[PDB]
Design an enzyme around this catalytic site. Structure first.
Site, mmCIF file in Angstrom:
data_model
loop_
_atom_site.group_PDB
_atom_site.id
_atom_site.type_symbol
_atom_site.label_atom_id
_atom_site.label_comp_id
_atom_site.label_asym_id
_atom_site.label_seq_id
_atom_site.Cartn_x
_atom_site.Cartn_y
_atom_site.Cartn_z
ATOM 1 N N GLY A 1 0.811 -1.211 0.000
ATOM 2 C CA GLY A 1 0.000 0.000 0.000
ATOM 3 C C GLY A 1 0.833 1.245 0.000
ATOM 4 N N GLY B 1 0.663 5.501 1.554
ATOM 5 C CA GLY B 1 0.031 6.543 2.352
ATOM 6 C C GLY B 1 0.592 7.885 1.949
ATOM 7 N N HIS B 2 0.764 8.763 2.933
ATOM 8 C CA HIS B 2 1.153 10.153 2.666
ATOM 9 C C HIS B 2 2.624 10.237 2.247
ATOM 10 C CE1 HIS B 2 -1.850 9.908 6.013
ATOM 11 N NE2 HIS B 2 -2.569 10.548 5.106
ATOM 12 N N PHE B 3 3.509 10.120 3.233
ATOM 13 C CA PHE B 3 4.950 10.193 3.026
ATOM 14 C C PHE B 3 5.515 8.871 2.506
ATOM 15 C CE2 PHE B 3 3.558 11.831 7.250
ATOM 16 C CZ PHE B 3 3.407 13.184 6.917
ATOM 17 N N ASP C 1 -6.187 10.116 11.617
ATOM 18 C CA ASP C 1 -6.387 9.477 10.310
ATOM 19 C C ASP C 1 -7.126 8.154 10.501
ATOM 20 O OD1 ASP C 1 -6.139 9.414 7.479
ATOM 21 O OD2 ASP C 1 -4.143 8.561 7.502
HETATM 22 C C1 LIG Z 1 -3.415 -1.219 6.040
HETATM 23 C C2 LIG Z 1 -1.920 -0.873 6.251
HETATM 24 C C3 LIG Z 1 -1.854 0.582 6.764
HETATM 25 C C4 LIG Z 1 -1.972 1.621 5.641
HETATM 26 N N1 LIG Z 1 -1.054 1.163 4.566
HETATM 27 C C5 LIG Z 1 -0.112 1.945 4.084
HETATM 28 O O1 LIG Z 1 0.630 1.593 3.173
HETATM 29 C C6 LIG Z 1 0.065 3.303 4.727
HETATM 30 C C7 LIG Z 1 1.269 3.931 4.159
HETATM 31 N N2 LIG Z 1 2.206 4.471 3.739
HETATM 32 C C8 LIG Z 1 -1.280 -0.175 3.993
HETATM 33 C C9 LIG Z 1 -0.904 -1.156 5.085
HETATM 34 N N3 LIG Z 1 -1.064 -2.593 4.650
HETATM 35 C C10 LIG Z 1 -1.861 -2.980 3.482
HETATM 36 C C11 LIG Z 1 -0.482 -3.647 5.324
HETATM 37 N N4 LIG Z 1 -0.708 -4.933 4.884
HETATM 38 C C12 LIG Z 1 -0.177 -5.982 5.579
HETATM 39 N N5 LIG Z 1 0.598 -5.859 6.690
HETATM 40 C C13 LIG Z 1 0.812 -4.596 7.094
HETATM 41 N N6 LIG Z 1 1.541 -4.198 8.154
HETATM 42 C C14 LIG Z 1 1.502 -2.825 8.244
HETATM 43 C C15 LIG Z 1 0.756 -2.294 7.210
HETATM 44 C C16 LIG Z 1 0.307 -3.467 6.476
#
Ligand SMILES: C[C@@H]1CCN(C(=O)CC#N)C[C@@H]1N(C)c1ncnc2[nH]ccc12
Length: 282
Positions: A18, A20-22, A131
Site C-alpha cells: 500500500g 500513504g502520505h509520506f 487518520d
Molecule cells: C493497512 C496498512 C496501513 C496503511 N497502509 C499503508 O501503506 C500506509 C502507508 N504508507 C497499507 C498497510 N497494509 C496494506 C499492510 N498490509 C499488511 N501488513 C501490514 N503491516 C503494516 C501495514 C500493512
C-alpha cells in the site's frame, strides 16, 4: 551487523502492499540466514519527509497493544525504514468488499470493540491518531483487526486537551470533526468522531459508493474546490450527518450518533463505546 536492527540487504522484497502520505509499505521476507526460514514483515519506506517517518517510528515504538500493528524494528541507511508485522488480509477497505457473505453484524461489532480498545489505549498514551478510517484498519483474520498506520498521529501535551495542527495538508477532511475543520484543534474526542465515520464504513462493508467522501460530496456538491471544507462545516453546523446504513440496527446507530455531537465535550468516550458495543454482544 547491528543485530538489533534489520539489515537492508536481507529485507528480500516481495510485493507492494500500500501507499500513504509520506510512505509506501512493502512485503519482504527478512532472511538473514539465507535459507528461507525468515519471517515475512511489512516495511514502510519513504516514497520514490525523513523527519516525519522518524516521528512515526517513535510513536509506534511507544505502542504495544493487541489491536495495534506490532512494531518490529528499524532498518537504517540518513534514511530509515519502519519494520512491522505483516497482516495478510490487508485493510478493512479491501477485505470487507470481498467478504460480505462471510462477515455478519456480530463480527462487525467485534471489530468495532477491537478498534475502540486500540483507540482507548492510544489515547491513554496521550496520542491523537488524526487518520482513523477503514483504510488504516488492518485485518489479521476474520476474528481480529488492528490499527495499522500512524503517519498523522500527534502527542497531546500533559494537562492539555488538544493538539494544534500547523500542517493540515494530509488531512482526511470527510472523517474530521468540526473543531478540526474550523480551528485545526485535535482532541481525543476528535478521534471519537472519526471512529463514528469508520463504523459507518464498516457497516456499509466499505462500498465505494457509500464512502463518507462520496456521501458528503452529494450533500454539499462536488465542485466547490477550496470552498469544500467551508460547505462541509456549514452542513455539519446545520446538524446533518451520514445516515443509518440499511441493515444497521437503531441501537448501533445511536452509538454512532454519540460520536457525532457537534461539541467535543458532548461526545461519548472510547471506554463508553467499548461497553456500549459489548452490551449488544451475546
Ligand atoms: C493497512 C496498512 C496501513 C496503511 N497502509 C499503508 O501503506 C500506509 C502507508 N504508507 C497499507 C498497510 N497494509 C496494506 C499492510 N498490509 C499488511 N501488513 C501490514 N503491516 C503494516 C501495514 C500493512
Amino acid at each position: 551487523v547491528d543485530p538489533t536492527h534489520f539489515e537492508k540487504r536481507f529485507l528480500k522484497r516481495i510485493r507492494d502492499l500500500g501507499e500513504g502520505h509520506f510512505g509506501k509499505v512493502e512485503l519482504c521476507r527478512y532472511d538473514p540466514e539465507g535459507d528461507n526460514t525468515g519471517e515475512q514483515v511489512a516495511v514502510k519506506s519513504l516514497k520514490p519527509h525523513i523527519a516525519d517517518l522518524k516521528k512515526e517510528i517513535e510513536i509506534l515504538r511507544n505502542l504495544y497493544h493487541e489491536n495495534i500493528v506490532k512494531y518490529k524494528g528499524i532498518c537504517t541507511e540518513n534514511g530509515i525504514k519502519l519494520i512491522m508485522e505483516f497482516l495478510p488480509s490487508g485493510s478493512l477497505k479491501e477485505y470487507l468488499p470481498k467478504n460480505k457473505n462471510k462477515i455478519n453484524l456480530k463480527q462487525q461489532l467485534k471489530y468495532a470493540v477491537q478498534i475502540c480498545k486500540g483507540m482507548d489505549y492510544l489515547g491513554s498514551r496521550q496520542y491523537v491518531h488524526r487518520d482513523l478510517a477503514a483504510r488504516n484498519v488492518l485485518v489479521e483474520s476474520e476474528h481480529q483487526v488492528k490499527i495499522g498506520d500512524f503517519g498523522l498521529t500527534k502527542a497531546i501535551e500533559t494537562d492539555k486537551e488538544y493538539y494544534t495542527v500547523k500542517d493540515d495538508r494530509d488531512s482526511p477532511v470527510f472523517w474530521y470533526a468540526p473543531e478540526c475543520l474550523m480551528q485545526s484543534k485535535f482532541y481525543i474526542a476528535s478521534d471519537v468522531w472519526s471512529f463514528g465515520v469508520t463504523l459507518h464504513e464498516l457497516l456499509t462493508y466499505c462500498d465505494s459508493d457509500s464512502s463518507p467522501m462520496a456521501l458528503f460530496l452529494k450533500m454539499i456538491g462536488p465542485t466547490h474546490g477550496q470552498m469544500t471544507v467551508t460547505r462541509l462545516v456549514n452542513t455539519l453546523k446545520e446538524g446533518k450527518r451520514l445516515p443509518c446504513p440499511p441493515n444497521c440496527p437503531d441501537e448501533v446507530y445511536q452509538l454512532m450518533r454519540k460520536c457525532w455531537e457537534f461539541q467535543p465535550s458532548n461526545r461519548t468516550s472510547f471506554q463508553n463505546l467499548i461497553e456500549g458495543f459489548e452490551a449488544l454482544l451475546k
